[PDB]
């Protein structure tokens, strides 16, 4: 009918707006933050996708966890995650944030950042290249594109 068409077009509009202006915050913990800085370099140019460089935590959309999440750092990570306005997304970069990586069996390393925050995109590597993090960002954009919030609201 008409209402389903209207909510489908509005959903496409809001998903295009959200996926094309992803403002990231980056947790500069370890090596993978240096590789994030290298993706923000002129060669790969995160800004040209609408993805700004080092936005504020109070206005960012996607939060990137690039490095090792230790036991002394995890409550601060949760506190930063809780203050982000919705819609919020989390990208895990590298093995240390994915599952612990080299320091998985350590006494002071959280075995994956998914034990603290919900994670949408997992980027594998040690460090994953700037190409790989760019691919993960674009895959997150694809995930945002196929969201169906207004259709779900109309059907309920």
């Amino acid at each position: 009918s008409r209402g389903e068409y209207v909510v489908a077009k509005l959903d496409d509009l809001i998903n295009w707006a959200r996926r094309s202006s992803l403002w990231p915050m980056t947790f500069g913990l370890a090596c993978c933050a240096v590789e994030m800085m290298h993706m923000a370099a002129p060669r790969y140019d995160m800004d040209r996708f609408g993805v700004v460089f080092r936005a504020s935590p109070r206005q960012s959309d996607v939060m990137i966890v690039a490095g090792t999440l230790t036991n002394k750092m995890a409550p601060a990570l949760r506190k930063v995650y809780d203050q982000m306005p919705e819609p919020r997304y989390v990208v895990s970069m590298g093995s240390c944030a994915n599952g612990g990586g080299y320091y998985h069996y350590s006494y002071s390393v959280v075995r994956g950042c998914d034990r603290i925050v919900p994670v949408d995109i997992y980027v594998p590597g040690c460090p994953p290249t700037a190409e790989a993090l760019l691919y993960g960002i674009l895959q997150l954009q694809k995930k945002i594109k196929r969201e169906k919030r207004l259709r779900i609201w109309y059907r309920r």
Binding site: L13, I14, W16, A17, R18, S20, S21, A41, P42, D45, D47, R48, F49, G50, R58, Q59, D61, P85, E86, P87
Partner: protein, 314 residues
């Protein structure tokens, strides 16, 4: 009929602000050996629309504000004072022809700091209040040199009327007899709108940390409108154009080009230098700019008397 004039003044201001955001992103990118946004639209022409919609569907922060009244009132004042400082601007004919338009602009610019003060006080954070107090002190301290420079420049004009400022520069540009005032005025307007290398609130808490994304966008839009307005005012003051009374489009195109070049110079400045410290810019103002501004003010009072060149009162 007059509301058509008001609307065609105020809607292109918002359009120019959004495309100023796009232009600044692209120019900084091309100045940092990279590209700006070129994926969202053809050469990023759709970036401000997407960014505006995203910021207007963002979750609000919902702070524990000490006063919801001034929490509402601060963006109201910021946007109203950003939009109301365009009506005596000659383009080449001002929308509201004012006999004292220059001093009206000075009054509005002096009144503009209440948004910073109320945004700092409304947020419960004490560090936000301290940042707001420092920003207010810097703003008023540069209001001082704005007033002295404008007073000393106006002695070649003869009145406070903004339309006579075109008539004064009918022969030569006003940057030729008052270039030190032009340099000090440009730096003072750069520090007036809180721009680099004077944007201390981005360097190590802002005055609007607890504000929601929408009101933050409104504050930022007011700041960019202030930037464009100040550059147009500087162009009118020092780089006056040739105005044919039968073809106003000549003056409109000429000062549009000059003011766009001055705003691009603002963006050029913001990506070349490190930021100042607070005491360093206070030293630059109270101990470098102010004595030379006073000396040049005395010089430009006593000069037209000794040259038999008093400008006409009317």
């Amino acid at each position: 009929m007059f509301m058509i004039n008001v609307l065609t003044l105020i809607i292109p201001i918002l359009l120019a602000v959004a495309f100023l955001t796009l232009v600044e992103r692209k120019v900084l990118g091309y100045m940092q050996f990279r590209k700006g946004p070129n994926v969202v639209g053809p050469y990023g022409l759709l970036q401000p629309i997407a960014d505006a919609i995203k910021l207007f569907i963002k979750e609000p922060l919902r702070p524990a504000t000490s006063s919801i009244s001034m929490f509402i009132l601060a963006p109201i004042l910021a946007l109203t004072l950003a939009l109301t400082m365009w009506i005596p601007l000659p383009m080449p004919y001002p929308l509201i022809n004012m006999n004292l338009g220059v001093l009206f602009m000075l009054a509005m610019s002096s009144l503009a700091v209440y948004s910073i003060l109320w945004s700092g006080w409304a947020s419960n954070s004490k560090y936000a209040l301290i940042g707001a107090l420092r920003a207010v002190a810097q703003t008023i301290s540069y209001e001082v040199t704005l007033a002295i420079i404008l007073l000393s420049v106006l002695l070649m004009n003869g009145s406070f009327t903004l339309s006579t400022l075109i008539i004064t520069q009918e022969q030569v540009w006003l940057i030729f007899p008052a270039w030190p005032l032009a340099m000090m005025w440009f730096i003072s307007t750069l520090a007036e709108t809180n721009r680099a290398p004077f944007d201390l609130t981005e360097g190590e808490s802002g005055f609007n940390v607890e504000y929601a994304a929408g009101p933050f966008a409104l504050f930022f839009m007011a700041e960019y409108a202030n930037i464009i307005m100040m550059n147009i005012f500087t162009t009118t003051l020092f780089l006056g154009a040739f105005h044919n009374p039968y073809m106003p489009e000549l003056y409109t195109i000429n000062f549009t080009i000059k003011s766009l070049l001055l705003s691009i110079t603002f963006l050029w400045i913001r990506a070349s230098y490190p930021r100042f410290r607070y005491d360093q810019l206070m030293h630059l103002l109270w101990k470098n700019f102010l004595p030379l501004t006073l000396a040049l003010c005395m010089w430009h009072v006593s000069l037209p008397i000794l040259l038999s060149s008093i400008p006409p009162q009317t």
